[PDB]
């Protein structure tokens, strides 16, 4: 019948960016005036579709990827973007066809002594791909030395904190994200809408 | 930001010390021990991070005889030593990591941990 969107928006903990959440949506119908006529977002933005028209579309799957991130990185949700998190977290890729949605969640990620259990990646030899996840743990090698798997100097555990915390700069408060992506596999769609 | 350790001293092998680190007070992402010992370089010890999931790391020589802890609330982290061993003989610093670059930027002044 009709999909589960409060399941993903209205969930009770989001994921740290670097270990984002996706979750495959399939077998409903989706009204996206539910949510763009409500909910009070900050961004909700569709490259390659119009947000009018997404009512008239059908796909074979839909996949919702939820992750947190400071304010001021929500710019890089977006194709062709840089920046730590969209080379070292999450990548969109330069064709995207999909939506971007956001908003303010200060009320429900800072903690007053301040939260700091949304991590993301500082470090990283390469810049991910399109939709690839990397949670490897292991010790950045920056310099000549081996690290063995020890920190020190040239040697730094990649996972970083946000210090989400009240009275933050709305630029470094906490923000939720969704990505909705709209796939069209040779097969019956599944996913359809009013 | 400031870090201050606690409790080092002398203990014949076999014996067990606690050193404490308060921070003056975090902020930072991952508080570490290191170790020194006279004409050494700076070895790491052991570190764990402000996240709660984790992030515990030991080296070998102390895997299984050291415990690293964090106390969030009262911004302290504690490393228990046991199994001490004359090898263990040093001047240990615990340092925290900037918010903003990943490397250990803030130290604290020493504490001076000796093993018969």
């Known amino acids: 019948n009709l999909c589960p969107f409060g399941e993903v928006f209205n969930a009770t903990r989001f994921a740290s960016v670097y270990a984002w959440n996706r979750k495959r949506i399939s077998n409903c119908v989706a009204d996206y005036s539910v949510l763009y006529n409500s909910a009070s977002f900050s961004t909700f933005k569709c490259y390659g579709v119009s947000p009018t028209k997404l009512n008239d579309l059908c796909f074979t799957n839909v996949y919702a990827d939820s992750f947190v991130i400071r304010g001021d990185e929500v710019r890089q949700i977006a194709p062709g973007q840089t920046g730590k998190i969209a080379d070292y977290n999450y990548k969109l890729p330069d064709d995207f066809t999909g939506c971007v949605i956001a908003w303010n969640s200060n009320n429900l990620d800072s903690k007053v002594g301040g939260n700091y259990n949304y991590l993301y990646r500082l470090f990283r030899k390469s810049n991910l791909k399109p939709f690839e996840r990397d949670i490897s743990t292991e010790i950045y090698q920056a310099g000549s030395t081996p690290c063995n798997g020890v920190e020190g100097f040239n040697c730094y555990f990649p996972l970083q904190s946000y210090g989400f915390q009240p009275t933050n700069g709305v630029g470094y408060q906490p923000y939720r994200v969704v990505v909705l992506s709209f796939e069209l596999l040779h097969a019956p769609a599944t996913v359809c809408g009013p | 930001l400031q870090l201050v350790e606690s409790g080092g001293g002398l203990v014949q092998a076999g014996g067990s010390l606690r050193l404490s680190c308060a921070a003056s007070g975090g902020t930072f992402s991952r508080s570490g021990w290191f170790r020194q010992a006279p004409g050494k370089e700076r070895e790491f010890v052991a570190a764990i991070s402000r996240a709660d999931v984790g992030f515990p790391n030991y080296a070998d020589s102390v895997k299984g005889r050291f415990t690293i802890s964090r106390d969030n609330a009262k911004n302290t982290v504690y490393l228990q030593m046991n199994s001490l061993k004359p090898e263990d003989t040093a001047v240990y610093y615990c340092?925290?990591?900037?918010?903003?670059?990943?490397?250990?930027?803030?130290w604290g002044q020493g504490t001076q941990v000796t093993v018969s």
């Open positions: 340092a925290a990591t900037s918010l903003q670059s990943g490397k250990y930027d803030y």
